[PDB]
């Protein structure tokens, strides 16, 4: 179950989904409303 090899499969892909569409958007803006 070597993960080190899996990360070398496509880190950019997951990196793109990690934020920059709604994840981080709804995270940083979530404070702007404070509600």
First vs last Cα of the chain: how many Å apart? 42
Quote the distance between the C-alpha of residue 29 and its chain's center.
16
What number of CA atoms fall less than 13 Å from residue 33's CA on the CB side?
7
Radius of gyration of the chain (CA): 15
Of the candidates 15, 13, 12, which has an alpha carbon nearest to the alpha carbon of residue 24?
15
Cα–Cα distance, 3 to 5 (Å, whole number): 5
Residue keyed to tokens 């709804």: 26
Cα–Cα distance, 4 to 19 (Å, whole number): 22
Name the experiment that determined this structure: NMR
Strand, helix or coil at 28?
helix
């Amino acid at each position: 179950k070597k993960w080190g090899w899996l990360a070398w499969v496509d880190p950019a892909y997951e990196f793109i989904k990690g934020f920059g569409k709604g994840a981080i958007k709804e995270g940083n803006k979530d404070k702007w409303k404070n509600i």
